[model samples]
Structure formats: structure tokens, C-alpha cells
Target chain A: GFRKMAFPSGKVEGCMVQVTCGTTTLNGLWLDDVVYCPRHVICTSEDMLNPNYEDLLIRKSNHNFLVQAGNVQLRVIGHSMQNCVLKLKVDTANPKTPKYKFVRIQPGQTFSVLACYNGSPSGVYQCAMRPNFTIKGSFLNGSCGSVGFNIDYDCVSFCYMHHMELPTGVHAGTDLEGNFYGPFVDRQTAQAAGTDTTITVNVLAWLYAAVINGDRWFLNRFTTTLNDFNLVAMKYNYEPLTQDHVDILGPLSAQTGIAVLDMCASLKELLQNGMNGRTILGSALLEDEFTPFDVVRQCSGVTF
Target chain B: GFRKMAFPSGKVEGCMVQVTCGTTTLNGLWLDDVVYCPRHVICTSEDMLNPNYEDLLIRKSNHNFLVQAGNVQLRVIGHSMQNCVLKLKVDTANPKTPKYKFVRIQPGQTFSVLACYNGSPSGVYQCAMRPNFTIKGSFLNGSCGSVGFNIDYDCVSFCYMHHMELPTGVHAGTDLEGNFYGPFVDRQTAQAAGTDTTITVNVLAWLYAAVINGDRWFLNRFTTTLNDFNLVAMKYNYEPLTQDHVDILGPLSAQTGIAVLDMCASLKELLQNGMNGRTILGSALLEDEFTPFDVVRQCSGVTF
Candidate 1:
């Protein structure tokens, strides 16, 4: 029994909500900022005619191909069926029917699906599997149905896709230093605070640096063989904010092959995140949770 | 006649603009929105109160290296003792003190400066040559003092070197069509829109296809290389997009040589940009514009 949302996507662009449950009734659920539970769960609405029922009980995956909510992990251990196509489905509030049908497990290999926990909770979600006998659900072999629903949880290990494991709040602040990144606040002029004179000066200076470096990198990396190599090999040793000088900035050694841009791009984000008031600074230095390319010294490890 | 800027680097960021003058005015003559002249020039603001007209202006071959702007084109010409650097009295408000001074002319070389319209209502402006010793009055060079005069018309082009050029407004809408590149607004909500979602889904889809082709040339030059090499390469025809399936999408490709997480980082931005109403649907096509790889190719000319 997970907390059902009144508005699954939480994207109530512009609308109202009213709620009534059993004998008890509550008003103005639309206007009040309260728990996210939909009216159908706590209370059903009788007055708001043409009410959207699925709003409380349903949600779609952000990527559309999958149903993603909170932290989700799907691990399957079975003989990879030869000549078998995989499909996926879930059992949800509508118990009589499957919530979704997706994923086709190939034979001979273990299958896993891990959604980075942008902080969504965990639950006992039922997954249904059907054999690849026919394209239509009705024609599929009934034997593969609901291989016993599993309680899927997001992979909590730091070694497993650390970026994805980060919650939405922290992820929102990630890699923000890139151009067109953010400052998504409402007021435009209030973005940077300073006297009229100093604001313009700061803007000019930042623009100058960002433009030059961005263009230089753009021109240097565009449509060339240099892009073929993973950029992590050429990364300058990123230090704390105190190392501001270019000389001390990076004593980088040229490598035969590595993703150089990845390092630079990551550095830009890391530094920019530091500047943008992330309470945690220099996350890049923590060796334990280093990303995919962290320990891989050779280019061959990274497949293009 | 024309606007002139000061520089000692003997260069401009891009194209060169020359200033040519017909009528000479020693009064308030504006060039690049500044006026320069000989007489009312402030010898020294502090000295004006003291009134010290000692009047010693260094003059050498009619050129003053110290009075100009920093650019790539305007280096001091030669070692010939016949030409010398000049120190002049300049009134930015007035425009007549011989736009600038000369140091020397390299043997067989000419100096280029600002140009202006003269003689008729139908006037023309272009790059023009001035003798190392030639002193002329025009707009830009007249008052644009060496490197740091804060003037609006003072070759703002150099300023862009330090600014962000990423275009905003138009966005990649969320249609996962055939191998199209992004610039992606929304995959789920946007899929309902008619074809041409302008999403990068198409590009992503295409990249995955290229990934499986087993060779880089087959992947990139499938279209252009065949045309360029004029060879009969096997055609890897991509399927067309129907509402049923997005041609651009595939089950994520080989993670080698590619940064899957980096790809995720971009995905975050695309979604955010889409929600903000700044993104366009189906605008960017080639992968090079946003990717670090493409940037390296164009700038370096070859991949490492």
C-alpha cells in the first residue's frame, strides 16, 4: 500500500481539487497545499463532475518507455529463453488488470532495470512476464504471467550509476554551470544582486569568460577524431576553488586516447555547482563514489 | 568619417573596418561615439586646476603606439629609427588630433585603419591604407584610447569573445521519431503531437544504428562519405517514423567510448529547457552542435 498521488505527475498545470471519502468530507483540497494523496484514496469527490479518476491512481514514466515513480529496481534471475522476446507489465491499484506490459527478457542472460532514485520511495510492484508466442497480449503464453510480483527497490549502491541514484533535489543542482543551465527563478533582473554598476560589470566579465572557453572548446572538439577518444584521459586535476591560477589549474599530460571533454564538462559543472551555493563543494574529489570512467585508465574500457 | 578603435595587437576579432575621412574637424568630432580633438584636450585633470601647459607631445613618424587599441593587425611597423612612437593630447569629446600616430612602416608593407564616406551623398566605407607617417582624422581611431576606453561603439565584437552564444527560444519538442538529433522538450506528453516533434530522439536513434554498424566510417559517412568518396558503400537504410514507433530511439547502445551518464546530464537539461518554454521542437539535427565530440572535430580539423 504505497502513498497514491492525487495528481500522479504532480504536474497540475492549472486546475482544482475537491475530496470526499466514505462519510467524511473535506473541501478546498484544490487550493490547500497538503499531502499529495489523490481524492479517491482519502476521499472521493461527488461535486466536481467529470473528475479525473486516474489522476489520483496513475502515473507514466518520465521517459515514456517505462513507468517510473520514486526509486525502482527490477532484477530478474531466470534462464534466458532462446528465441524468446521479453515484455514487461506491473500490477497496480487496478488489481483486476495489469498496470503495464513491458520488457522482453532474452535467453541466457540475467536482466536488470535500475531507475536512479531521484528520491522516490520503494514498493512491492507486481511484474508480469509473457512468452514471445504472439505480438498481441491475448496471444501470448499465459504460463509466463506475473512471475510472482517482486518488491523492487532502487539500487542503493554508489557504484551503480551514482548520478541516477541522486535525488531530484540534488540532481537539480548538478552540472548547472553549463550554458543555458539555470537561474530559473521568476524575476529576471534579480538574478545577480549588486549595485547597477557592479551587476553589469559582473555580467560582462562572466559572459566574456564563458563565451571564450565555450567557443574554444566547441571549435576544438566539434566533428573531429579528438572526439572519438573518451575525454576523461585528458582531464585536468580538478582542485578546490582556491586553485584559480591557470598554471596551477592543470598540469595535464597528453594521453593517446581518453574522453577529454567529459572531464572538462564535469569540471565545469562541479565548479559551477560550487559557485551556485550547493552546500556540498568538490564532490568530484571523493574517490569512493567516482563515476563510470573514474578507475578505467584505458580508452578501450569506454565504448562509443 | 568612420569609427576607429585603439589597439596595439595589430588585430581585430574578425573582419577589419577602416576609417577614411574627407573633411577634418578639430572640434567635437564623434567616432565610435567619442569625440577627439587637440585643443580642449585635458592635459591633466589635476593640472587643469594647476594650469601647467608644459606641452611636450612625443611624435614619431606620425604614429603613437600608446594611443591605439589592442588588436592583431596594428603592430608597430619596423625598427627604422626614422619612425617613432608619439604621445598626444587627446580630448575624447573632440575629434581632430590626427586620429592616431605612426611608429614605422615595415619595408614593403602598408598600415590599415578606419575608413569614412567622403565627397558625395552616395558614400562608401571600407578598409583603407594609411602611410606609417600619415595622420588623418576619423571616427573610431580618433578617441578609442589603448585597450580600455569604455565606449559603446568601441568594437563590441571583441566583447562577444567573452559572452554566451547559445541560442534560446526555439526548442526540441518531444517526438521520438527516426534518427533525428535534438536541440527534446517532452517524450511522454509530447509524443501525442503530430510527427516532427523536433526531438533529438531521431538523432539518438540514428546514433544507436551507427553504433551497431561495426565501423566509424559506415556510421558517419553513410550519407556524406558515400558522396565524398564516390564509392558504393552498403546503404544502411533507416526506417521511417510512424506514430507507432520513434525511429530515433533504441535500447541504449554500447556504453564504450561514450559517456552514458554524460548523455543523462544532457537529458536533464533538455527536459528542463523544454518545461521552461525556451526549447523548440525538432530544430537541431547534427550531433556536433551540442556534443563535445563535434566541437573537437570542427576546431581541430581532425580527430585524434
Candidate 2:
């Protein structure tokens, strides 16, 4: 699936759109620079019928993959229809590329891209497994939308993620030295909202030191008040507010009232089952709706 | 805190080091190149007195920001440390400049560098908040060490984290959307790890789908055996493991053993304090030898 490079923000008229296919270092390492329509001319092969149109010429010997590049997939989420065009290109990098011979996906759906790594004749590929996942993409309509979670590296699980058999273990009696892994064993595991982050006990202390020690600097008054020290103590001692800054306030205000759950569920299924779409499946659930909450369909089912 | 650009499998020796400092769209705008000792033999001022030797001078002023060029912070991981050095020059096309300033980390400590921002000074500054965290050097014993947790865009909490004060009623009715925040948040807020992250409730179905559909190639043997399928019946559909795969078994393995209650309790505390230095305050308890079911430490301080 290709997202055309042009901001929906401004300059809609007379804007030239260019769509090209190539590999990206991003997860799929797929094609980018997709051009949708050119100035309402309804861009298509008919428009490129010029006898000397070299750009539209397809070289089968060099590019072997088959694709109906103009096919668009539309899925509705919330009240908006998310549309994406799937384009296939020959992965000429490898001489022995599999025969399934193509990659397919929707605008918001990345499961096909990720799941396709399962030795699919065409899609199975090899690259350094990213150890950390890069969370890409932003929110739309106050909803957590398509996120590109990248990995630091790839890993082959022996069990469907139920068990981890390390090739090497620590000295016979010591604790296992590798990363702790498990199956998508249980469904009712802990799910948290926000990011799966970590903090040290010392860092918390340092933060508290900044807040508690410098009480005056840590706060400022919201409004005028009586002559008490509390009256002068404002809320946080930094940065002025702006419209752009206020746009940021949306997520903050939203994260509070609307619990951002980081569920301990398979990310795969989350991609498939989310109101948005499937999320990689897992066993943890991080939500604010309820302590140890359950998942329900919300702000889902839109295809544009 | 940037390093010389080299292949991850190895490091380039004796290359000139560079550093830069800046903001989101224009970060690392300033640059400084240092000819490190050994690489560029920073001779003593006395060495310049030799009649036959032309004094080599390094300009520092106009750069405005403090820049240190040295080969001291040079080492490679994942692959061998020795590799051929290809001369590299400053590439300033990207917003975040590739130059760096070197800081010495004392034994048993780590280094954290912070650049100047809006409310802070107008120049670069090192983050003394965590001083030098010891997670890397502390737990990196010879026998057991965790894979390096790679960071693309580094962030800390107290730095850019903004909270909103929402009206109790208006706050309750909104949705909290997920977004990829840049580096600078506390480690706890880094969203670094999760077995399988998502909304809860889909864990059960995901595990089932893992079997009904062999999409997760890792579950080949485990599912075949667990689901009671004979190889002759399934024929040849199994895929071999790869080094790039992430072990998806975190949830399963943790549950199979007697999870030390204290470990989970500590984890709760770790999450509670937000992102801070004390996040691992009670981590030593996880290493107590008296326990039967060894509690795995996933956050920090664990050997792996």
C-alpha cells in the first residue's frame, strides 16, 4: 500500500503528484512515492498512451512482479473512509525471489505485510530483525490510528510465541540470560495504556526532587488568589501555550479521560481486531476504561 | 552523543568524529569535528615548537557551541570491533546533524547528553538528571549480557512530556490517541518493551488463529505437536527459524513458572513512579537466590 507524498493540509490546486515504486528501509521495505491523480485528469494508462511515453513502459525482464497498480482498497473507520492503493513491484534485489511474486495490503492494514513474512512464496524475505519497533504514524479524529511498529531485529519463535528455547543458557544454575519470552499463552494478562516503557527508581527520585524540592519553580498560579504561598504557586514552571501547543493539549486531555490501554494481547490480532483494524496479537492489555479492562469495539470500521 | 558512522557488524577505526546540536525540524544544526588522538595525534603544544613540525591547529570559536572531537568513545558491537576505516565527511542533509560531543562515563556509570531547549539555556547541555545510568555497565557482566537496546530518536519525560488539565466532564468524554513521541521521555515512558502489545480480549483468539492458520511460522513444531498433527498429514510446510525473529513467547514462559509476587509488585511500583531513576529501586529482590521459581527481570539491571 502506498501513501502519496503530499500534505492534505494546504495547496490542493495545481499540485503535481509523483508515485514511484521502490524499497523502503521501513518494515515492508516496500514501494513509496505513489502518485494518485493528476489535476483531475483521472490519471490512468489511457492518459499515458503517447507513443513516446517512456515512463509508462513496463520492462518485464527487469521488473518481474505482477501488479494492478491502480487498484484501490477502501475501508471505513469511524466516520472516515481510509483509502490505499496496492502496488506490486519486482524485488529485483534477490535473484531467487519466491514465486508468490507480489505483496498486497490495504491503506490501514499492515498485517498482510507482517504476516506475509511466513515464508510466502513471494513475500517471505530476510533482513536484520529490528530489535526495537518504531511506532510511526499519527492519530486521526482523536483515535489511535495505523502505527508502524518496527523491530530492532527479527526473531523466530519456536512456539507460536508460547515458549522460548534459547540456544544458549546462562551457567547451569543461574537465571536464564536471554530475553524472557512466552506464548500468547493467556488472554487475561496485564494490559497497560501509553507506551511499554521503563523507569528506574533513581530517575523517579530525581524527578520528584525536581518537583518537590523546587515547589515554587514547579508551579504557578492559574488565577489570582489570596496572599498565601499556594496562590503564587502555578502549574509547572515552563513553556507558554500556543495554538500549535494547544493541538498537543488534545492528546493530553484525551489520554486522561479516555484510558489508553496497552493490552497484553497479541499485536497481530490487535491489528486485525481493533476498531481500527488488526493489531499484533499479545497477552497484555493496557487500558484506562477499566482496571484490568476488557476490549470492545470502539472507533473502528472505516474505509476510505 | 552520536558516534562515527560505520557498519553495525563492525566499527571504522580512526575516523574523524563530529557532533551537532538542534531542535525537532532543525536539530543538530551546529557541527563540530574533532581530530581525536591516535586518529589525529593531538600533539602537545610543546610538539609544535619543533622547527621541522608545522603546528596543526583546530578552530573552535564561530561554532558557538562546545564541540569535542575525539576517538575515545569508539567501539562496535554485534560484530567484530576491527574493520577498515573508510574516510567519511560530514553529511548535513538530515535535520539532526551527525556531529557529536564526547563525555567520559566513570566506571559503573553511563552517559546521558541533553541539548539546550526553549525553557532551558539557548545552548547544549548534558542531562545530569540520571547522571550516568548504570544499566548498561552495571548489568553487563561477562557471563550474561542483554542485547543492546537500540535507540533511534532518544527522548526523556521531564523534558518534553506535557500534561493537560481537563475539565472533569469534558475530559471523560474523549478518546486518547496513540502517537510516536520523540526521544527525551523517561525510560519508563519509552514504550520500549511489550510481549505482544494491544487491547485485551483478543489474546485467546490470537493463540487459536496461530494454530488454525500457520501464519506465525514460529509455531510450526510447537503447534503441530500441541495440536496433535502428524508431519505426514501436513506434508512439508514448516519454516526454519531465523536470527531476526523476536521470541514471541514472553507471556507463556512467564506464566508457566511460579511468578514471584514481589517481582510483579515491583513492576507495578516501577510503572507507578512514571519515568525516573528509582524505577528499579527494588530490583535486587528479583535476584534473591532463595526463591524456587526464578522471577525474570525484564526491565533493567538483569544480566540479559
Candidate 3:
């Protein structure tokens, strides 16, 4: 019903690319950078080229959003490629490491991780969702690749991510004088009191007292509270203030800690569908590979 | 003055501690997770305790957000403390880790980096933005600590972070077509087209064609387009839909990509107060650490 795709350079070659492709009630593809089909074959690009050259010219259409051919570990993880394999090992011969050493995930495939104890670095393997996801690499051979699963330890999701949106009975240490939220109607309902995060159970009760007192100086090796405050302002260097970087109703409630890290990455796809990302145990894990970070450490007792 | 400070626990008996101390009138303190002093004296935690014991019980107030305790590399790069020392090394003995490894700033102290060849990563040191901001640790140290300055290399500053906001001139790969922005007035103008961002030069022109078809395998190595799409969905694993993961005016325009990464982190502090962060080339930098990302590689040459 509609089509147009003949752009290689400039003078608005039919405005780069815009197609509807044949009958297309709705089936088309290309999802990484994106391209759909109910029509709007897409390409609003061109306002006279300026968000840096419209982002390097819509990246020459990113290999037309690929039906296949490279990226996502270049898929291939066979058993007939229904796919599933992940490997990660970082061992510069033990640089004082110890929190995350295995993630064996099995089912007729491989999902390896042997780090923190025995020095092993060259890790790579690939393949993804449409199936044929066969990722391979041991100490290094299948080429190095990574993205997704940022391992900061057990990682959160038993429920409890609330930084905002309370009052449906409000609870996280307890006091509830007045309370303030009337918006949330359900990002997943959150019974254990889990979801909503611009961050503030008063800075998640000081990161639950820097991980139950073992704050070990700068909130024990956790990740994403803005890379743990850029690693605690780079282990304390960017001076000023001590406990409330502004937020009684001022500014810093949410600026670039990614809107309180996507408000703690709200509902990680309903926690990855509520999990099944497997683990009979390369030792034990499968709440989607739990490193155990209970979303803002369950804001207890609270203080300034 | 009104003080009581004596908590290091539970029982609710006076709820830990809540200090207010002497004559106050807007000359307050603590500014990282927030604390100010126009007095809310802060800490409204507890509702029968829960959000993870309320974030490990407010991380014992993070050494009080430090007036000077420990973190930022234990601050001590001397010149009589009023310091400025920062060191980082990563000679990972040589892996394929280029793109960054040099940042030697000066005046009376230090700020160093030397990698991208000779592979370095043992990088460490401390001291921060106060007067005494010296950090020492070349390769290895008395120990090691890091949190701030996350070098993704050079790092964006020329401007144009926009993914939303038009109306003034609306130009980018150009094709006016009916256009769709209606919320922004200014994050900092952008005569060259700047700020707004929930991200969309249509996925930032596929990350400007994986960084100008030196698209190599994924997108040269660029970071944050959501870690480069979780490293291209971990190099293509979770796949479906070839493009447009919705958003023909549907889903996908903004969601845990950190609201499109703080809408490209809004105004990076007015682009770090329009530069002056310093860089006479310890070989060039200062427009706040220029890795030269050019916000979405300058969305040009669109297609597909």
C-alpha cells in the first residue's frame, strides 16, 4: 500500500527511507534501533540536520534494523538455535575480588560465569532472542562481547523499590504522617511494596546504612544508585554536603541518576516476566540471577 | 541549639537520633543524597520498616555525606591539603581497551591518565572537589578506591543533546513533515540544536550508524544509548520486531533507558557551566572531559 526506500546520500532522497511494505496489516520487523509496519515505515528524520547531524544521519539506517547479520553476540547459540548462553569472567589474576564467581545456567546449553577466584578474562559468546542464540568463548576464542546483565551482586527483585508513591497503607520502617502519592495505579501493583523510584526513602535510608553497617567505607561494592554515586563521588572527591544532596522539595530528587535509575529501572520487564532466566545452580541463582540487592535495601528505620 | 545525636540502632526509643543544633537561617549543609539545613532536620523513615530495612537503615547517614572522613580516595594529595590530585592507570598488562587513558590537569596538584596503548586499568587515586582534592594511586596503591569520573572517553560537550523540543528552527536531517515536539523552551537553546532528550532522533539515528560505519561490529564502542542498547541486546539476544519496538506514537519513546538517560541528562549543569573544567591538552579535555561523542553522532545521512 505504501513504500519508499532509495537513500544513500543527501538532497532529501525521498527523505532517506520511509516504507509501508506491501499489504502489511502489521508484521514487519527490525527492532534494535526500531522500524515497524502498521505504516509510518518510519523516518521523521530531517529538521535540517542538527541533533549532531540527526545522530550521524540515522546511522545510515543501521543495517535496515537487521533480520539477521551481527550484533547480540551475532546469534548462533544452537541446539537448533532456540538459543541461550551467557559467559562472563574477569580475573586479572585476582585483584582482591570476591563477589560473584559462577552463573552456570543450563538446559541443554551454556550460561557460564567463573570469576572472582581463578584469574580468567577473555570471555565472549553470542546469539539472542529470535533463536539461534549460540554464544561461545571460554578464556577467549569466540570473540569478546557483553551488554545486559551488569552484575552488581545478586541485584534486586523480591519486591520493594519504592522511592515515591506511598499511601496505599505505606510501609518501609513506619510512621506515615500525612504521606504523599495519588498517582500510581499500577506499574505492577507492588504488594511487597515494590515499584516507584525517583529515589527517596530518604536516599533509600542511606543505602540501608551502607549495606547493613558493612558499608566498608563507601557503601559496599554495589552498583547503580548512579553507579553507586559514581562510586561514592569517586570514593569521596567531589566534596560538599553530607546526606541529602537536595530533595525536601528542592532539586536533586532526579536529575541524571537516570531519573532515579529509571526509578530503579521500574519493573525490569515485570522482573524479567517474574523470572525463569534459570539456574539449577552453577551454585544457585534464578530470581533472574540474584546477587541479592533488595531495591534500596528495604528502607528501614530511616534517619538523617 | 537543639541536639541529641546518639544512635548507632533500634527499639524506636526516640527513633535513633534527630539533631537540629543552634541558630539556623539558610546556611545549611550535606548535599549529595541531600541534607541542607533550612531545617527539615531530615529523616522521616519507618512505617513498620520495609523498602529493604529502609535502604540498610539510611547507610548510617554515609559518614554524614562526609565533612571529611573517608572515600574520594581517603583525601590526601597534599600541598597542605587544600588539594587537587587525581590519578588513574589501567595498563591491564594490554587488552583492546583504548578510547581513554589520559587526563593530567594541573595548577598546584595532579590529574593523570596514560592508556589506550600499553593497556592500563589499575587506575586509582583520590581527593575531590573541595580544596584538598588530591588522589594518588598509579597502577596500584597502598590500597585502592574509585567512584567518580567514569571515563567513557572524551565525553560529549559540543551540544545538541535533543531528542525532544523543536519549534524554534526544528532542523536535523530535515524534512519538517509535520514534526512532533511541543514541550521544551530551553535547556540551553542549541542554535546548533541542543538538549531535551527522552531520546529519539529515531534511536539517535541508530547511534549515528554505529559511529560512522566504522560501525565495525556493534557501534564502534560507544556507551549509553542505554549502554549502547545493553550492548546491542547483549549483541542481539532478546530479539523481536526488526525495528520500531512500537512508538509509531506507541510505546518505546521513553522507558527505563533512564527516561532516555536523563533525557541525555538534561543540561549537564548548563554543559558544566559552559566549560572551564580545564584542558590545555594533558592533550585536550575540558568542555568537561570531551570523549567527543557529539550527542548522537550528529544525526545525519538517515535511512532504512
Candidate 4:
């Protein structure tokens, strides 16, 4: 006989659990592909229950994301008690290279930094994904399941990952040179010589060096590229090009390209366990101490 | 037989030099007392010309001298390249106890700190001097006869030295018991038994305790004491307190009451008469470098 269980069959509160009742029984299943977990299922139509992913507020407002010609500003807010470890990358549209950054956020604290993207002339820019972005830590409440770290851009992109899935492959059509480009099977090959494709839209550095320098063509090109990049971002899912995106993309390329590679390169090391990688947890209930994987929590019992 | 001399007689620029026109002739003399210096003097009046003692500028305005019941704000400005060392002491009225501090000021730099006084009942406070405030140093410009440090306060008294000279002895009238008190010969006997003297107009502490805690009395006492200390400094002829005081009082004694004893206890050790100690004159001309006893000039070469 089975007893009634909470909405979430597992340890996580407010989480939707999954249940199976066939010859065999599996309960509290977490789906990685859909980023969903459902309550008990009576072998009903497959449902996609949204998981309770914690939020790390990256872009609070327009001001927080301002991107200058030579710099990109970033602000990260921690909403949950759990510490957030984040890795960010910027990509350019032409040469398709990435610039990487890593930051840690304490619970309820905000971390802000400006990434410098000077030294080179500006061109197309975008926020791209890296392996670290896909990595997630074990849940603090329990081992219900784990989800990839993600950021939601209020602009034209739901997140950088969604933009990665955009059509830049062979199926998207050929250029004026008459060549076929296919969608990337993996992030690595996507950067190969001819396989990599970019959005037709171009991005411009915030300022035009030529207009003031007396060159009309470069000035016109700069404004046009900036306008097109902003328009496409705005058109797609209302992800308007923002100063935040500009700031992020300004200094984010290895050279000059929009492709972000390194698909889960460090995922194996982080996800040592099949599902719940590590068991470390922070709690007010636990005594204060330190361990390689442990975190200290705000607590009562004793003072150090 | 006579050659034109540099502006300052001995060392620093614009420094007031002392000139002795008698059987033995000495020029660019720096006086310890009076904090005075005259540009020109004649052999007629036999004037004991006081050297120009610069202001330390302790009190910038009336507000700078304003004392509260809880806080005492202190600001010290350094106008010379030579380091300015200072010694400061705080005293309580009834208990007649003293607290001391020492600070270093680099050339062209300013130093500031707030002194906290809290946890006592409201009472009288005054700024009294100690012998430690009467020191100075070698000038930096030429031989203008640079001297000891100084302070500027806009209060009822001059610097603490003037107050130190206040008659707290058997000559000054009665204490609480209507018994006459005598001047203290030294600090050791100032706190003896019940014979103690205080400044007539009690100073106020800078802040009030009611806005914070019950310790308003002590807090105000501290501010009032600090205020008096600064005021008298402003009132008196610039007594030119110096880093020499710090170098001197740094090792001075403890215990309460008004009196700075053993003037110039350590000066003998420092004026060792070695090559470097007596030489190295500051200049507007020397190329930035170090040399022993090398006097830098305003323009061309002139050896002393």
C-alpha cells in the first residue's frame, strides 16, 4: 500500500515530484533535459513540471547592465541562502572567440565588477555560454535533483543557452559565396574554420573613432552595426540589446567572433557523482567549522 | 669680507634666522620660546629676536573648536617636507588624569582622528599644556632656521603650554575645601593627596550622551577637554609645537595634573655632531637624490 506524499515526493520543498506505478515503481524523479520535476504521476500523459531553480539576479535594471565602448559592467545578486558560483563569457560575431570570467556570490550579497574589453576595435558582440555555466551544485535542502546554472536575460534572449541553439549551422542557408552551413553537433566543431556561422546582424563599439577622425564609412558602419544588433535582440523575444549586453560583450572576445565553445569541459570533474555531485551543505543547525566542500551558515547555538 | 647669503640663514627656505651682533657673531638662530621671528633687526634695541614659528593649524575654524559631550575631533596639517611629529594629551577635571597620544605627519600631508569620551557624568574640562609641546625641527628650505612644531586653536587659552604655566600652586586661591593649592614642581607630586588645580573656565565635551547612552558625562567631558586644548592653542602666540616634542614626550612619564618636566631630555643624543646630523640642508635646487651633509641650493653650486 502506498501513502499520500507531499507535492514534491523528495526532500525539496515547493518542488514537483515524479511517480511511476507499473510493474516497477520509481518516485521522485528529476528530469535534466526539461529542467522539470513533477508530483506523483499515475502513468498519465507526460508532463513538464518546472523545477524550482534559484535566482541569481544578474541584471536588475538597465543601469546595472550598461556597457561602454571599452568596458562591460556586471552586477550579480544572490537571492537564495546558497552561495552562487558563476562563470561568464563574452563572444564576438566575426572570429568567434570567447573571454571568460568567474565570480562567487554570497547569500543576500551583491557582487559587481567591470570587465575591460579595450585594446581592439569593436565589432559584433554577444553573451555566450561555457561549460561552467552548465554546472550546478547540489541542492542545499536535499538531493531531489540538480539543474544547470542559468541566467535569464530580459532582452531578446531567454538565456544565453537559448541563443546557442539559434540557427547558425548549414541548414540556415548559404552565403553569397554558395556554400552550405550545417548546425553545430557540438560546441567544439562549431568554431572550426568554415562550419561556424554568425548572425547576419553586426554589433558596433559604442563610439565611432572615425566620425571624429573624419572617416564617414567607419562611422556609418559603427552606428549601423549597433542599431542592427539592438533591433534583432529586441525583435527576438523582446531581448532588446542593452547596455548590460554591450558591457558584457565589449571585453568578451578572445579575438573578434561570436562563438562560445568549451561545451561542459569541466562538467565531468564537477559532476563526479551521477546526479548529486557532493553532499556539502550549510545550515544554521550545524556547528560552525570549515571543510573543503562545506559552507558556514548563520546560526544560534555558540559564538566563535 | 661679506658675501650674500641664501634667504634662510642655515637650512630651510623662508625660515626666520637668528642673528647675534656682538663680540661673538651667530646668524640664523632658531629660538625655542616666543614662537616669533622677525625679518630684520638692528643692533640698537638688543632685541632677543624670536624665530618665526609656523602654525600647525590644529583648529581650522570656530566649528573646528566646537566641543560636544561625546566626541573630540582633531585635525593636523603638515606644511613642510620634513616630518611633523606631535604629542597630544587629554585630561579629566575631577580625577585630574591624563591620556596621551603621538602622531607623525609627512610633508604636505594632513592627519586627522576623533577621540571618544563617554560613560561618565557631565563635568568641567580644560586644556592644559605639558613641556612636550615646545619642540621643533631643522628647516627644509635653506637656513631659515626651521624650528619646533606648533598648533592653532581659537579657545580661551593658548596652546597647552600657556595653560601649563597657569598657577595651580599655593599661590592660586582655594579648592573645594577652601584650601590654597600650590604650583606643582613636577608631575610626580601634582597628584599628591588632595591638592589639585584646574583651569578656571571648564571646557565642554564635543557631544552629548543623551542622544546615545547614559555615559553622557564622560563623553562630554572628553569633548570639552579636547576643545580647551585646541582653543588655548589658537589664543596664544604660536608656541610652535614640534616633532621634537613627539621625539621628546614619546618617552615622557605618566600620572596626572598639569606640568611638562625635563625639557629636552633626549635632544643631546640626537644632536650627536656627526657628519650627517649637522649637515644636509634642504634646497629648492638639488636634483632628487641622497647625499651626506649635502646642502641643496636654489640654483648653482655654493658649499657651506
True contacts kept of each: 0.00, 0.00, 0.00, 0.00
2 versus 3: better TM-score goes to = 3
The structural similarity of chain B in model 4 to the true chain B, as TM-score, is 0.16
- What is the DockQ of the complex in model 2? 0.01
Candidate 1's C-alpha lDDT? 0.20
Best by TM-score: 3
> Candidate 4: deviation at residue A149, Å?
20
In candidate 4, what are the lDDT values of residues B1-304, reduced to their tens digit?
A: 0011111111111112222222211122112211121111111222222222133122222222211212322221111111111111112221211122212322211111000011111101111121221111101111111121212111111111100112222111111111122332211123222322221111110011011112121111112232334344334321233344223222122211111212111111212221221211211111111111111111112211
Q: Report every candidate's CA lDDT.
A: 0.20, 0.18, 0.20, 0.18
Q: DockQ for the candidate 3 complex?
A: 0.02
Q: Worst lDDT window (10 residues) for model 3 chain B?
A: B1-10
Each model's chain A TM-score: 0.15, 0.17, 0.17, 0.20
Give the lDDT of residue A208 in candidate 2.
24
lDDT of 3 at B61: 38
Best by DockQ: 3
In model 2, what lDDT does residue A211 have? Answer: 29
Q: Could you give candidate 4's per-residue lDDT for residues A1-304 as a string of tens digits? A: 0000001001111111222222211212111211121111111223112212232122222222211212322222211111111111112221211122212221211111000111111011112111112111101111111111111111111111111122222111111111212322222123322322121111122111111212222111122234544444334322233344344433322223322111011111212222121111211111111111111110100100
Question: Alpha-carbon error at B84 in model 2, in Å?
Answer: 27
Tell me the lDDT of model 2 at B32: 23
Q: What DockQ does every candidate get?
A: 0.01, 0.01, 0.02, 0.01
lDDT of 4 at B219: 17
User: Per-residue alpha-carbon lDDT of model 1 for B59-171, expressed as tens digits?
Assistant: 22223322232121222232111111112322332221223321322111112221211100100111111111111212221221111111121222121000001122111
